[PDB]
Amino acid sequence: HMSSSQQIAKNARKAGNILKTISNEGRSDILYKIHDALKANAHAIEEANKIDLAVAKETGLADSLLKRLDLFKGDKFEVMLQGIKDVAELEDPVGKVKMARELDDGLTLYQVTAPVGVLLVIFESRPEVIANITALSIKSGNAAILKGGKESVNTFREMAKIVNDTIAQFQSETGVPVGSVQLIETRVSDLLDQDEYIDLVVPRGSNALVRKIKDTTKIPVLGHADGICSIYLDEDADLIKAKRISLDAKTNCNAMETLLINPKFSKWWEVLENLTLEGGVTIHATKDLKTAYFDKLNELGKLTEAIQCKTVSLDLAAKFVTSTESAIQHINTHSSRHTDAIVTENKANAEKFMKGVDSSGVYWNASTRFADVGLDGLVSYQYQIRGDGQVASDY
Amino acid sequence: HMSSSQQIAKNARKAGNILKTISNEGRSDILYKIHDALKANAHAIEEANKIDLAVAKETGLADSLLKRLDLFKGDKFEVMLQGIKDVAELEDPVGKVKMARELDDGLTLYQVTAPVGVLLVIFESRPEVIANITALSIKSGNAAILKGGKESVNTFREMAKIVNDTIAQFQSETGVPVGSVQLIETRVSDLLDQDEYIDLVVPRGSNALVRKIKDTTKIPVLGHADGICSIYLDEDADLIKAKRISLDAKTNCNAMETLLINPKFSKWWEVLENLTLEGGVTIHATKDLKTAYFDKLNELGKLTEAIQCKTVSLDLAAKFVTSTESAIQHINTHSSRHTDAIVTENKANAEKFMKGVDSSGVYWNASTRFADVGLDGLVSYQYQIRGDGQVASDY
Numbered sequence: 001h002m003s004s005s006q007q008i009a010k011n012a013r014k015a016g017n018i019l020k021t022i023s024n025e026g027r028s029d030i031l032y033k034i035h036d037a038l039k040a041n042a043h044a045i046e047e048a049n050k051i052d053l054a055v056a057k058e059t060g061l062a063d064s065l066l067k068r069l070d071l072f073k074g075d076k077f078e079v080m081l082q083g084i085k086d087v088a089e090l091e092d093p094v095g096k097v098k099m100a101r102e103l104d105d106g107l108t109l110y111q112v113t114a115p116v117g118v119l120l121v122i123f124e125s126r127p128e129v130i131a132n133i134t135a136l137s138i139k140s141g142n143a144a145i146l147k148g149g150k151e152s153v154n155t156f157r158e159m160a161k162i163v164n165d166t167i168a169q170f171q172s173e174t175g176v177p178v179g180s181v182q183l184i185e186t187r188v189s190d191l192l193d194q195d196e197y198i199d200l201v202v203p204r205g206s207n208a209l210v211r212k213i214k215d216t217t218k219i220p221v222l223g224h225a226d227g228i229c230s231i232y233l234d235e236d237a238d239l240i241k242a243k244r245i246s247l248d249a250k251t252n253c254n255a256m257e258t259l260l261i262n263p264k265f266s267k268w269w270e271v272l273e274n275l276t277l278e279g280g281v282t283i284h285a286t287k288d289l290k291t292a293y294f295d296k297l298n299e300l301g302k303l304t305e306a307i308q309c310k311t312v313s314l315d316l317a318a319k320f321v322t323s324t325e326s327a328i329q330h331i332n333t334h335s336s337r338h339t340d341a342i343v344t345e346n347k348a349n350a351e352k353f354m355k356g357v358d359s360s361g362v363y364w365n366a367s368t369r370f371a372d373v374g375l376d377g378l379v380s381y382q383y384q385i386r387g388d389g390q391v392a393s394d395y
Numbered sequence: 396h397m398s399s400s401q402q403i404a405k406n407a408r409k410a411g412n413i414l415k416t417i418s419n420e421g422r423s424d425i426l427y428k429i430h431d432a433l434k435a436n437a438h439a440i441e442e443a444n445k446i447d448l449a450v451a452k453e454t455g456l457a458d459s460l461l462k463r464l465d466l467f468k469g470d471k472f473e474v475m476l477q478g479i480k481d482v483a484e485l486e487d488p489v490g491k492v493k494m495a496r497e498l499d500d501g502l503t504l505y506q507v508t509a510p511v512g513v514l515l516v517i518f519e520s521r522p523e524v525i526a527n528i529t530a531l532s533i534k535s536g537n538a539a540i541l542k543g544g545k546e547s548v549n550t551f552r553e554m555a556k557i558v559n560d561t562i563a564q565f566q567s568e569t570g571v572p573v574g575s576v577q578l579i580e581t582r583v584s585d586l587l588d589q590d591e592y593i594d595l596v597v598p599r600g601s602n603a604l605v606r607k608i609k610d611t612t613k614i615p616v617l618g619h620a621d622g623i624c625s626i627y628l629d630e631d632a633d634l635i636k637a638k639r640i641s642l643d644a645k646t647n648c649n650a651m652e653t654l655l656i657n658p659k660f661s662k663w664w665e666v667l668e669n670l671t672l673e674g675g676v677t678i679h680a681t682k683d684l685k686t687a688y689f690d691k692l693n694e695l696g697k698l699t700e701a702i703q704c705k706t707v708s709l710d711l712a713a714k715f716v717t718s719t720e721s722a723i724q725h726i727n728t729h730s731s732r733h734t735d736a737i738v739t740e741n742k743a744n745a746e747k748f749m750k751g752v753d754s755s756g757v758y759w760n761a762s763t764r765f766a767d768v769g770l771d772g773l774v775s776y777q778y779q780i781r782g783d784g785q786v787a788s789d790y
């Protein structure tokens with residue numbers, strides 16, 4: 001049997017295999033038509049975005065995301081339309097020779113740009129994405145699947161209709177097939193399992209979204225080759241070591257880090273406060289940990305302004321872990337390609353941690369850092385060898 | 396929702412995460428108990444294998460696989476039992492230090508053997524596998540999932556019962572958890588999609604089985620990093636080039652190759668006959684191609700003995716492809732990490748092929764070879780750094 005997400009991903013692969021062979025004039029042309037269709041329907045899009053903003057205001061939405069949601073504030077919409085033209089006007093990203101090497105007489109190797117394949121784009125609260133990604137995908141010869149959050153449902157619906165319709169309407173003229181771009185109108189998380197068909201995930205949102213995607217997928221994530229890296233600060237963590245090791249994981253960077261803290265580790269809060277007011281690090285705490293951290297600070301009078309604003313470059317999450325076994329369990333839920341560290345003076349715990357974790361690399365009392373959207377990440381490479389009958393048996 | 400195969404794979408991952416931390420005495424001990432249980436139940440296993448042999452004889456089964464099916468011929472069963480002991484007697488494969496490097500004073504790096512993780516073992520018609528793989532898996536700290544073919548259903552059933560029961564019976568004594576080995580009694584091909592949980596596929600059967608597995612999975616396959624590589628011999632293939640290029644793909648090897656032949660390519664049979672009686676290559680033909688190949692040979696009187704036996708090291712399949720577009724379609728159904736070649740003098744076709752294929756590397760009139768069970772492949776490596784508070788900021 002074929003699931004909904006499987007069929008979506010399969011159709012994307014089929015669409016991409018046609019899209020990759022369509023001329024630049026055909027791929028650029030559909031972008032001009034789409035620009036025109038979006039402009040001609042601006043008023044309908046604006047009304048749908050108006051429903052979205054007002055719905056978000058009346059429910060729980062943070063004034064930051066709310067400002068990202070407004071497509072018609074200032075000249076946001078006009079810039080988005082302009083970006084479609086800018087992209088359509090670029091030189092063909094595909095079929096460019098990056099490297100040519102004469103291997104032997106009449107035997108030449110080329111490295112040629114080619115589409116990545118199929119893109120899954122997951123965004124939250126920024127409707128501009130639909131236009132930017134549709135443009136970049138068709139231009140670069142990639143099929144795309146787009147999934148937005150609840151906040152833009154109305155704007156997403158209207159824009160999807162216009163792109164779907166325009167692609168259908170101009171297929172015979174442009175060559176660009178229906179399905180080149182599929183805009184998923186909440187019909188699932190099974191898409192992240194389709195790594196036989198999907199080549200790249202492009203996340204457009206918060207750090208929390210990236211972390212969630214990383215843990216639920218084997219498809220490469222644009223800009224994030226590594227999984228979440230954890231430091232477990234054990235009950236018997238040395239505090240000086242715990243402070244230096246944990247700070248060093250910041251001052252080295254585009255990486256996703258979790259601090260796993262044993263509550264029985266004495267002065268564990270001095271470690272978080274040392275990260276904030278010495279490394280300028282923002283700490284994304286779980287509710288129960290933040291409530292415990294703030295109480296210890298307020299009891300000491302040390303709950304300064306500089307802590308309150310930086311407790312919710314580098315990510316850094318922090319949560320409790322009440323034993324070595326619990327730290328292991330937490331670590332073993334992360335999608336692989338991550339390193340992990342334990343800070344402890346207890347050898348029985350260190351050895352248990354190192355035997356227990358699913359990790360490429362594991363550190364005991366040493367820093368994990370000892371381990372050595374545009375068209376950018378949307379084109380890959382194909383090698384082509386063009387000879388005249390040469391075989392691997394030459395003298 | 397969680398599918399049957401997802402739950403199987405998830406439980407395997409959970410089992411493996413416990414199994415990896417059980418002592419060698421515990422892992423070796425369960426192997427001795429399993430050896431004893433299989434020996435004590437030999438007569439029951441023999442009766443079940445008797446049903447299997449007689450069922451296979453009365454239906455369509457090839458005397459080759461039939462001979463693999465007989466567990467009690469000669470001393471096959473006694474050797475299998477002996478192999479369990481041999482494995483239980485080996486030195487712990489896990490926790491061995493392969494490499495130690497002093498990175499700095501009191502900062503040392505180790506490369507330590509560790510389990511691969513979860514193994515999916517798919518075999519056809521060889522019941523010995525159940526014992527060998529169960530032994531190697533538990534010994535090396537890997538959880539295993541076993542799926543056999545229809546031919547051994549009875550022997551598989553009886554043996555599964557004995558292993559399941561023994562693992563359950565001795566869990567509190569050995570530490571080795573229920574689920575360390577799951578023997579799937581036809582309850583699916585969805586397991587090959589579980590690459591978030593399954594780390595390695597171990598195929599134990601024919602080349603056709605390997606090819607099928609390779610095309611239906613993103614999980615690495617033991618002994619087969621590369622996908623199926625195709626050579627398309629176009630209508631306008633030069634015959635001298637077609638012969639040399641295609642022969643060279645043999646005389647270079649453990650690889651899976653398909654020859655895609657255009658029927659309108661003149662003397663295309665001379666290419667297959669050149670592979671057989673010059674490279675000693677066996678050709679695994681589709682029915683319609685073999686029937687066409689034999690007729691052209693019989694019409695020329697050239698259907699020798701040496702062709703008939705070698706038409707059904709290197710695999711080499713052969714099938715028809717009636718255009719460049721059809722060759723492309725065929726190639727694009729293969730799971731990635733493969734190179735592909737077109738042999739043609741037609742440039743429009745060559746360029747279409749190179750633009751159309753999903754391939755790392757593509758060759759036009761040049762040979763694809765220009766691209767540069769024991770405990771062996773069941774242990775991977777973990778790096779461990781053991782310091783005393785050292786951070787990535789040293790002078």
Ligand SMILES: [Cl-]
Nearest residue numbers: 097110112384
């Ligand atoms: Cl070129």
Ligand SMILES: [Cl-]
Nearest residue numbers: 097098099100
């Ligand atoms: Cl150049």
Ligand SMILES: [Cl-]
Nearest residue numbers: 100101102108
């Ligand atoms: Cl050159």
Ligand SMILES: [Cl-]
Nearest residue numbers: 492505507779
């Ligand atoms: Cl060691």
Ligand SMILES: [Cl-]
Nearest residue numbers: 492493494495
């Ligand atoms: Cl050594």
Ligand SMILES: [Cl-]
Nearest residue numbers: 495496497503
């Ligand atoms: Cl050393």
